[PDB]
Every structure is written in structure tokens, then in C-alpha cells.
Amino acid sequence: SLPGPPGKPKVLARTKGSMLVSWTPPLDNGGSPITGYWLEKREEGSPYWSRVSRAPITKVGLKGVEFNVPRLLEGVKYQFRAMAINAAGIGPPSEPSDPEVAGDPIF
Ligand SMILES: [Cl-]
């Protein structure tokens, strides 16, 4: 009924204050269409997971569903996890992304 976990998110772009995060839809949507996703972040120095958007994320980019996470702090290390939403509710989280630091990218 609930959807399965989305794929492990990947950071596709970063700046000092943002990261473009992308993930694949779950293999099992639970039997009803997924209507959107929640994305949460966790930083170094805190155990908590925090939603990064006020409304569900739906944008499909080149590699998966994606969102540019704002309000990151330069030099801080973050991970992200995504949850799918369907008619039954919010599914379990993806595996967390590999850690990434907010900073500008290697040229
Ligand atoms: Cl980089």
C-alpha cells in the first residue's frame, strides 16, 4: 500500500550554499501513483533530519526526481534522504546519500 523507498539520492551539483540532489523513484509504488516526494537533510553535529521543501517535490530531471536544496552552510557536510508519497501516505526513507560538503565544485 505505502510506496517503497526511493533510490539513494545523489548530489549532482553543489555550491557554497546549495546542492542539487536527485533520486530515482521506488521500484514499487505501492499500487497507486506516487504524487510527490519529501526530501530531508542531516548535517554534521546534529542527529536530526529536516525537510527542505514546504511542499512535495515532483520535478523530473535528467537523472531522476530532483531538487536544489538551498540554505546550506559553507563547509558543512550534509546527507539527504527521500520519501515517496502515494494515496496511502508517506513511504520509508531511501538510504542516505553519500556525504557532501557545501562548497564550490572542483573546476
Ligand atoms: Cl566537486
Domains of the chain by start residue, with CATH: 10-102 (2.60.40.10)
Q: Which residues pair with 90 in a beta bridge?
A: 85
Q: How much distance in Å is there from the Cα of 49 to the middle of ligand 1?
A: 24
User: How much distance in Å is there from the Cα of 104 to the middle of ligand 1?
Assistant: 7
78 C-alpha to center of ligand 1: Å? 14
Cα(33) to centroid(ligand 1), Å: 35
Structural biology method used: X-ray
